[PDB]
């Protein structure tokens, strides 16, 4: 279909991929660091979702350099993805409104 809509979809699939990969890499980067809690996959996936959405309750977070780098990628992917959906919705309302004004 239209670009903005295809990009929205792509952004969603790519976000899902980043969440999964991020959950995997977070554990890989955090184990070995005493005190770390982001060390099992199920909760790591929960952590990735709350980072991507930026809710960040604070029940889980990386304590190592690599874990934090993984976290930044997750945050940026989430922020970008959600922002790209907003823009797609804007491009949609703008076009429809152009019609309603017979332009």
């Amino acid at each position, epitope marked *: 279909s239209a670009l903005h809509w295809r990009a929205a979809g792509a952004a969603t699939v790519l976000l899902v991929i980043v969440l999964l990969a991020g959950s995997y890499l977070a554990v890989l980067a955090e*184990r*070995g660091a005493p005190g770390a809690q982001l060390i099992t996959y199920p909760r790591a996936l929960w952590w990735s979702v709350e980072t991507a959405t930026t809710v960040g309750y604070g029940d889980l977070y990386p304590v190592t350099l690599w874990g934090r780098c993984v976290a930044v990628v997750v945050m940026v992917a989430g922020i970008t993805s959600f922002g790209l959906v907003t823009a797609a919705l804007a491009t949609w309302f703008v076009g429809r409104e152009q019609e309603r004004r017979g332009h």
Partner: antibody
Amino acid sequence: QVQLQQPGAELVKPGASVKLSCKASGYTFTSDWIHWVKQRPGHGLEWIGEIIPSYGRANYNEKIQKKATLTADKSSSTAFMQLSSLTSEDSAVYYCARERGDGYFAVWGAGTTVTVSS
Amino acid sequence: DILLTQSPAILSVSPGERVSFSCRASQSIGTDIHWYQQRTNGSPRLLIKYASESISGIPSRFSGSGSGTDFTLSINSVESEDIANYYCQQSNRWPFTFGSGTKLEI
């Protein structure tokens, strides 16, 4: 069927080193970690270290003296633990266990009795 | 590093009673505690995961409760086969650690 196969025993001369093996079977996932646990006769379970085969990284118990080096062979699904320059203090049963990345040791090996003697 | 205290180290119970093993963590670890049974000359065997979750193939008379720093492993109607050492293990913070263990005696 036995998910983790370990040799029953290994005799080692003080100062020498031995390479313990652990052959896995059953389901295998990229998220599996193989752990090694040391148990001296009459004592408790002491965590040695862990390794993630699909990636090859290993972590070790920082509280104890490092005597182990962990590796894994993906094709043969075998995890190894190289114990080096051992002494009588290193004599114990060494178990290997599989953790599905969710924190608990779902299964253990029968264990390998290591004896350091001349 | 999280310390897991298992006291008493030995429990003397009569056949058929309900016995309770205690496990205390040096800090709050939610429900990330797992229990293992090791009979004489046997390897450890998972009994309960995450403080209270059943494991298939394990007698229903085994149960666990607790959260935070205090955990309990219970056995309803104890019997000869339950004679062994019982260990708790935490997976809340790296590295994973084990309790000193508790022996069941009938």
